[PDB]
Amino acid sequence: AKVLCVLYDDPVDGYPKTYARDDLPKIDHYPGGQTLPTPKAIDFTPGQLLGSVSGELGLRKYLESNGHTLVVTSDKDGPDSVFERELVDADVVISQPFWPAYLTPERIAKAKNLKLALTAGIGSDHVDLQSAIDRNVTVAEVTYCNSISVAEHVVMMILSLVRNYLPSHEWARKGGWNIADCVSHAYDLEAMHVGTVAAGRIGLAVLRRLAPFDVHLHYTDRHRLPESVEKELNLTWHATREDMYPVCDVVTLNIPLHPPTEHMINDETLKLFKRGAYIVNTARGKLCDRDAVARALESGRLAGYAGDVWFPQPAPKDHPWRTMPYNGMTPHISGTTLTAQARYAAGTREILECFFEGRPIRDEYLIVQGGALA
Amino acid sequence: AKVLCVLYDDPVDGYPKTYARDDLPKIDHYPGGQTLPTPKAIDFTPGQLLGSVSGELGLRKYLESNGHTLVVTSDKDGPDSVFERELVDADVVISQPFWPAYLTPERIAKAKNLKLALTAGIGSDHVDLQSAIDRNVTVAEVTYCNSISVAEHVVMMILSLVRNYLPSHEWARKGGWNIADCVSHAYDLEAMHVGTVAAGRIGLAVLRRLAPFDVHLHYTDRHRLPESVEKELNLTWHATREDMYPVCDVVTLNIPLHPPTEHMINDETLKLFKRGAYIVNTARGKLCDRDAVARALESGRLAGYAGDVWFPQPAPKDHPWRTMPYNGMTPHISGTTLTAQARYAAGTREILECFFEGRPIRDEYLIVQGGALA
Ligand SMILES: NC(=O)c1ccc[n+]([C@H]2O[C@@H](COP(=O)(O)OP(=O)(O)OC[C@@H]3O[C@H](n4ccc(N)nc4=O)[C@H](O)[C@@H]3O)[C@@H](O)[C@H]2O)c1
Numbered sequence: 062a063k064v065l066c067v068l069y070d071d072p073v074d075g076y077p078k079t080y081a082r083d084d085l086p087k088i089d090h091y092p093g094g095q096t097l098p099t100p101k102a103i104d105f106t107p108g109q110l111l112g113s114v115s116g117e118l119g120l121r122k123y124l125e126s127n128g129h130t131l132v133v134t135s136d137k138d139g140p141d142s143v144f145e146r147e148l149v150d151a152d153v154v155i156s157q158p159f160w161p162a163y164l165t166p167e168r169i170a171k172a173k174n175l176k177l178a179l180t181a182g183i184g185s186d187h188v189d190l191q192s193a194i195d196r197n198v199t200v201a202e203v204t205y206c207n208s209i210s211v212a213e214h215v216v217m218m219i220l221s222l223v224r225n226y227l228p229s230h231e232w233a234r235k236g237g238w239n240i241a242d243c244v245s246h247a248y249d250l251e252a253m254h255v256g257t258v259a260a261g262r263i264g265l266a267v268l269r270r271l272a273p274f275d276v277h278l279h280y281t282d283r284h285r286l287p288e289s290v291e292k293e294l295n296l297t298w299h300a301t302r303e304d305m306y307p308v309c310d311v312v313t314l315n316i317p318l319h320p321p322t323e324h325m326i327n328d329e330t331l332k333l334f335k336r337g338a339y340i341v342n343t344a345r346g347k348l349c350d351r352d353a354v355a356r357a358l359e360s361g362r363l364a365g366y367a368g369d370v371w372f373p374q375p376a377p378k379d380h381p382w383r384t385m386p387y388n389g390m391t392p393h394i395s396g397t398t399l400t401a402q403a404r405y406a407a408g409t410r411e412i413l414e415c416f417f418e419g420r421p422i423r424d425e426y427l428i429v430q431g432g433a434l435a
Numbered sequence: 436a437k438v439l440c441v442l443y444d445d446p447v448d449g450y451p452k453t454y455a456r457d458d459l460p461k462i463d464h465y466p467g468g469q470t471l472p473t474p475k476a477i478d479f480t481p482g483q484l485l486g487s488v489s490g491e492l493g494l495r496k497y498l499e500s501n502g503h504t505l506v507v508t509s510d511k512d513g514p515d516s517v518f519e520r521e522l523v524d525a526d527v528v529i530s531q532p533f534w535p536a537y538l539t540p541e542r543i544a545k546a547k548n549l550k551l552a553l554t555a556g557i558g559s560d561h562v563d564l565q566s567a568i569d570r571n572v573t574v575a576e577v578t579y580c581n582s583i584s585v586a587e588h589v590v591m592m593i594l595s596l597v598r599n600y601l602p603s604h605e606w607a608r609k610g611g612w613n614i615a616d617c618v619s620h621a622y623d624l625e626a627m628h629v630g631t632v633a634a635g636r637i638g639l640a641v642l643r644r645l646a647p648f649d650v651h652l653h654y655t656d657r658h659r660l661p662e663s664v665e666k667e668l669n670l671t672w673h674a675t676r677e678d679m680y681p682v683c684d685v686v687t688l689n690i691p692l693h694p695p696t697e698h699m700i701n702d703e704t705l706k707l708f709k710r711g712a713y714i715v716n717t718a719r720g721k722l723c724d725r726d727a728v729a730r731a732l733e734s735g736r737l738a739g740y741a742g743d744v745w746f747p748q749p750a751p752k753d754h755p756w757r758t759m760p761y762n763g764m765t766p767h768i769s770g771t772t773l774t775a776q777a778r779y780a781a782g783t784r785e786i787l788e789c790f791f792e793g794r795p796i797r798d799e800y801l802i803v804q805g806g807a808l809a
């Protein structure tokens with residue numbers, strides 16, 4: 062078989078020879094009982110850079126020693142990209158949401174041998190599922206591989222915005238001291254009201270991590286949590302999003318992007334926020350109107366905004382969230398820590414081994430098989 | 436009835452006219468039951484900048500309407516300072532540990548009217564206690580006012596160091612993207628081993644906030660925690676610090692500085708740390724050999740160091756910790772958020788009202804009284 066795998070670029074100084082540490086913490090299962098990936102073997106050491114072109118998700122020896130071919134590229138955009146060239150006879154396509162190779166209807170029509178569309182990570186929005194259903198292509202992803210990673214990133218950003226970490230560190234780095242300059246915008250998080258807009262895997266993991274900070278927890282979602290869970294975390298439920306914003310000091314978005322949530326944070330809905338609110342968005346860039354957010358921070362309607370998701374992505378060089386007041390942005394990285402990469406490279410190999418050996422792919426990995434069967 | 440009060444400078448662009456939010460979260464008590472300060476009244480709005488020269492801890496109208504004088508300065512260092520000149524007849528001296536007016540033996544000898552040494556915050560380290568005992572000066576502090584603030588700062592720095600937040604935010608800020616450059620030094624915190632060197636007010640608050648991150652918790656102390664707390668937080672006790680270091684991925688220092696702890700982190704003890712360990716130090720700068728820490732980051736033995744405490748303070752513009760690799764420094768600020776300032780400005784006024792009216796200062800505020808430690 063031919064496996065076509067799209068990854069992001071190696072670092073500026075090259076593929077790293079050494080790493081900061083030797084191994085990764087041992088983990089058995091995700092919250093809720095789903096066990097971590099179980100490939101038969103792996104050909105990488107956990108903690109290596111796996112999501113760049115030279116990392117190859119640790120796949121080449123396993124594939125080439127089994128008669129398969131592996132094409133790894135970072136060129137994914139347009140009809141004359143390496144990706145679209147190699148796609149016509151590829152059996153398997155793999156990409157990460159951090160550099161996704163879009164499987165449009167027209168691309169899937171051209172992919173004569175395509176049988177498996179694999180997401181190395183979480184989030185198959187780059188794959189047209191109706192075309193996969195019609196064409197009998199399996200669509201899978203490494204469920205849960207980076208939900209905890211993103212949750213950590215969220216709480217880190219909450220603390221950093223509220224306490225004014227990033228300008229304070231800049232004073233230290235640039236040779237200043239300037240205590241009043243640092244803390245004129247610095248508060249404690251304690252006893253603030255903090256809401257999450259969804260509360261699925263990331264939203265719940267964020268709520269658990271916030272609880273011992275003695276914040277008052279709020280959430281909204283289409284489907285209420287078991288009030289057993291509501292009782293343990295002392296959650297206030299809001300049936301609608303617009304009800305939750307006004308009572309929150311901090312709001313984190315952990316909701317999927319689709320037409321009803323597109324630009325859900327806009328000039329109109331930002332006026333429902335308490336003056337000086339904080340928003341953290343590690344979900345999707347287009348949940349927020351780019352310029353409404355920028356206006357809110359210049360006017361002080363928000364006192365901070367942080368996230369790793371942008372629109373468009375990758376963010377253009379002059380994108381306003383890069384330099385607006387009190388931003389805590391990173392590039393799109395939160396689910397591709399070296400830790401997460403080890404889990405989803407292993408998950409990728411587990412799915413490939415099942416697929417080539419004709420064994421069942423884990424039901425929790427599946428999105429499409431014959432039909433929208435998860 | 437002369438109050439000499441030393442505060443830090445206003446922000447470089449002047450004392451603020453507006454603030455990010457209108458109020459502060461409501462808090463009743465500290466962990467363990469101690470109530471927040473209870474002055475008869477306050478002449479500030481909580482959330483205002485009170486610890487700088489124009490904030491005056493909100494004290495002027497209360498002192499002056501009672502016939503006292505208030506002298507506020509930021510010039511405190513050495514014999515030619517405003518502070519030394521005003522000290523000769525001050526009855527009350529007030530100082531924050533973020534900008535401390537040192538009451539050395541020689542200075543206290545010159546302070547002919549000195550009756551009360553008040554710390555606007557936590558940490559009588561700047562006051563020679565034997566001199567205060569010998570001269571019957573009362574020494575008091577606003578106990579617990581910023582313990583939670585520092586604990587939040589610790590967890591914030593741990594997450595930032597492990598996930599490589601600060602260089603990632605620089606890539607975003609400067610117009611780049613560079614996913615592999617961001618994450619070649621980024622890990623999850625989950626299931627790491629994290630140890631605190633002591634488990635007092637801050638150390639226990641740090642441990643409680645770390646628990647839902649699913650880390651493995653470790654601690655040292657002269658006195659063990661109660662067995663019920665050990666099992667509630669699933670703590671591993673270590674009898675010596677040196678016995679704790681080799682199993683920790685993260686070590687946070689929450690211990691006072693005195694001879695047995697000075698330079699306790701040095702070229703020799705650093706060889707006990709795991710490769711790629713992180714250190715956070717919001718305690719005191721001189722707990723660490725300054726150049727040994729920098730050497731350990733330059734040579735790749737430590738994956739990160741962060742804190743808000745330095746030696747000396749303020750840090751000179753070329754202090755090595757400002758620019759050494761993988762540092763997360765701020766200036767000394769973690770206990771002077773606008774939230775914390777509101778508590779210790781209220782407590783400062785409470786203590787002053789007690790002292791001038793002859794009512795007993797709270798026992799938990801007292802360090803020295805009546806010629807003895809108390
Ligand atoms: N590297 C990254 O930045 C990164 C990494 C991983 C994932 N993601 C992003 O992609 C999403 C997945 O996040 P998720 O938590 O992993 O997904 P899920 O568990 O299915 O979500 C809970 C659900 O919310 C729902 N819902 C749905 C529609 C609606 N109109 N209202 C609702 O309320 C429904 O009820 C359910 O609770 C976003 O969260 C965001 O994180 C980004």
Ligand SMILES: NC(=O)c1ccc[n+]([C@H]2O[C@@H](COP(=O)(O)OP(=O)(O)OC[C@@H]3O[C@H](n4ccc(N)nc4=O)[C@H](O)[C@@H]3O)[C@@H](O)[C@H]2O)c1
Pocket residue numbers: 557558581582585632633634635636637638655656657658688689690691692695696717718719743744767768769770771
């Ligand atoms: N803005 C800031 O950065 C800031 C703010 C407030 C305070 N501070 C700093 O000044 C200290 C107070 O911190 P603390 O936790 O408030 O003080 P405490 O409750 O008395 O300490 C727990 C004790 O540890 C002890 N101990 C002692 C000696 C020894 N050889 N072994 C031990 O084990 C003993 O056992 C007990 O548990 C440092 O911690 C650091 O935080 C910094």
